[PDB]
Write an enzyme that holds these catalytic residues in place. Sequence first.
Site, PDB file in Angstrom:
ATOM      1  N   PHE A 209       0.870  -1.174   0.000  1.00  0.00           N
ATOM      2  CA  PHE A 209       0.000   0.000   0.000  1.00  0.00           C
ATOM      3  C   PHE A 209       0.905   1.221   0.000  1.00  0.00           C
ATOM      4  CE2 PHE A 209      -3.159   3.038   1.773  1.00  0.00           C
ATOM      5  CZ  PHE A 209      -4.209   2.805   0.949  1.00  0.00           C
ATOM      6  N   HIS A 212       0.686   7.587   2.093  1.00  0.00           N
ATOM      7  CA  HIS A 212      -0.556   8.313   2.304  1.00  0.00           C
ATOM      8  C   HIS A 212      -0.504   8.952   3.685  1.00  0.00           C
ATOM      9  CE1 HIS A 212      -1.011   4.516   4.293  1.00  0.00           C
ATOM     10  NE2 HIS A 212      -1.982   5.037   5.023  1.00  0.00           N
ATOM     11  N   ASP A 214      -3.481   9.728   6.836  1.00  0.00           N
ATOM     12  CA  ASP A 214      -4.735   9.126   7.252  1.00  0.00           C
ATOM     13  C   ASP A 214      -5.909  10.091   7.157  1.00  0.00           C
ATOM     14  OD1 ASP A 214      -3.334   6.952   7.743  1.00  0.00           O
ATOM     15  OD2 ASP A 214      -3.753   6.795   9.891  1.00  0.00           O
ATOM     16  N   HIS A 268       3.038   7.593   5.630  1.00  0.00           N
ATOM     17  CA  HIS A 268       3.503   6.233   5.869  1.00  0.00           C
ATOM     18  C   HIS A 268       3.028   5.336   4.734  1.00  0.00           C
ATOM     19  CE1 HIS A 268      -0.333   6.783   7.912  1.00  0.00           C
ATOM     20  NE2 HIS A 268      -0.559   5.483   7.792  1.00  0.00           N
TER      21      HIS A 268
HETATM   22  C1  LIG Z   1      -1.999   1.307   7.231  1.00  0.00           C
HETATM   23  C2  LIG Z   1      -3.079   0.422   7.821  1.00  0.00           C
HETATM   24  C3  LIG Z   1      -3.979   1.171   8.784  1.00  0.00           C
HETATM   25  C4  LIG Z   1      -3.895  -0.240   6.681  1.00  0.00           C
HETATM   26  N1  LIG Z   1      -4.383   0.746   5.728  1.00  0.00           N
HETATM   27  C5  LIG Z   1      -5.625   1.231   5.721  1.00  0.00           C
HETATM   28  O1  LIG Z   1      -6.500   0.831   6.482  1.00  0.00           O
HETATM   29  C6  LIG Z   1      -5.913   2.370   4.739  1.00  0.00           C
HETATM   30  C7  LIG Z   1      -4.904   3.495   4.941  1.00  0.00           C
HETATM   31  S1  LIG Z   1      -5.032   4.204   6.597  1.00  0.00           S
HETATM   32  N2  LIG Z   1      -7.258   2.851   5.040  1.00  0.00           N
HETATM   33  C8  LIG Z   1      -8.219   2.999   4.154  1.00  0.00           C
HETATM   34  O2  LIG Z   1      -8.143   2.501   3.055  1.00  0.00           O
HETATM   35  C9  LIG Z   1      -9.427   3.756   4.602  1.00  0.00           C
HETATM   36  C10 LIG Z   1     -10.574   2.837   4.984  1.00  0.00           C
HETATM   37  C11 LIG Z   1     -11.817   3.579   5.446  1.00  0.00           C
HETATM   38  C12 LIG Z   1     -13.013   2.677   5.780  1.00  0.00           C
HETATM   39  N3  LIG Z   1     -13.426   1.902   4.612  1.00  0.00           N
HETATM   40  C13 LIG Z   1     -14.161   3.524   6.296  1.00  0.00           C
HETATM   41  O3  LIG Z   1     -15.223   3.532   5.563  1.00  0.00           O
HETATM   42  O4  LIG Z   1     -14.026   4.171   7.334  1.00  0.00           O
HETATM   43  C14 LIG Z   1      -3.081  -1.286   5.946  1.00  0.00           C
HETATM   44  O5  LIG Z   1      -2.540  -2.161   6.710  1.00  0.00           O
HETATM   45  O6  LIG Z   1      -2.976  -1.288   4.727  1.00  0.00           O
END
Ligand SMILES: CC(C)[C@@H](NC(=O)[C@H](CS)NC(=O)CCC[C@H](N)C(=O)O)C(=O)O
EC number: 1.21.3.1
Length: 329
Positions: A209, A212, A214, A268
């Site tokens: 990933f 980005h 948060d 991150h």
């Molecule tokens: C970095 C971690 C937190 C994780 N990444 C993630 O969870 C990534 C980046 S923070 N997050 C997202 O895509 C947002 C999800 C939002 C969720 N559908 C909602 O409707 O609220 C990973 O392990 O990839």
Amino acid sequence: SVSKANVPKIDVSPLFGDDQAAKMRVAQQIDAASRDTGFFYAVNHGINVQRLSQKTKEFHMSITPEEKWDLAIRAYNKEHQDQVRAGYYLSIPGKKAVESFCYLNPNFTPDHPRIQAKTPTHEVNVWPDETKHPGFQDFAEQYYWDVFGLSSALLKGYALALGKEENFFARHFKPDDTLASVVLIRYPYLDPYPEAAIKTAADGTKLSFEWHEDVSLITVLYQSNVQNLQVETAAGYQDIEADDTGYLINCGSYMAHLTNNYYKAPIHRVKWVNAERQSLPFFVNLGYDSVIDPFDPREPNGKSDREPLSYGDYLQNGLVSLINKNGQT
Ligand SMILES: CC(C)[C@@H](NC(=O)[C@H](CS)NC(=O)CCC[C@H](N)C(=O)O)C(=O)O
């Protein structure tokens, strides 16, 4: 060759109590971490993370393709037009390794006023069959409230760290309207591992990933014991070590917005590692109409030119932007 990031372990247990000086000493530690790499591990948090990991594994490893379609968000199932956020996010064998299940505030029911009003970002959670996943819904709803409670305590720490009264953020983080979400992410072991699911960074690092910030006020994250996260610092990307007994905490861009970038949302990314593991974030989001006035703790008068931004607008637009930038997960 990659340096380890400084990610202190902060005993946050005083933030659940009434010892004000001890809370100030925790707040100082949160301030220091927020000003440095932007990450810390919350320890002594009181949550049964072994049960969280075990129950999440039992769900991920028993759910079938049929059940995933029946729970799928609209990105994977056009029949589910109301499921923008909550539901199953499918893998695509040969192309996409990651898969996950997202759920929202359990208090969002058909009779909740925001559901009745069809306000964006609010949805009624979808759940698998109880007989096929005994105890899962009850476990998951209780987990939401347990991590809600930890997050409330952490928000008292952040408020004190910024020179505010301890409920400055927490008063606006409420069981009846919070837009917070839990995501139960499975990152699988796969061999052959699908190359389309690996991205290569500018420095050559293979990633699951990309970089980005948060979309959150803060993020409260459990991960199983496989090192994967990296934080960007002035000195380059640095490895965040794993700690499957703690919660990894960082600020999101709404905190940066409210503090005039005094607490930055750290950038991150997730390294590619071919290992079965879990990434279980709780995104601390406020209510749809929450609109705290931005401030600037660097200024004697504490005032900031930034305009107030209601949380709901911030969240709806932020989640779309993150999909556009880093792909539909
Ligand atoms: C970095 C971690 C937190 C994780 N990444 C993630 O969870 C990534 C980046 S923070 N997050 C997202 O895509 C947002 C999800 C939002 C969720 N559908 C909602 O409707 O609220 C990973 O392990 O990839």
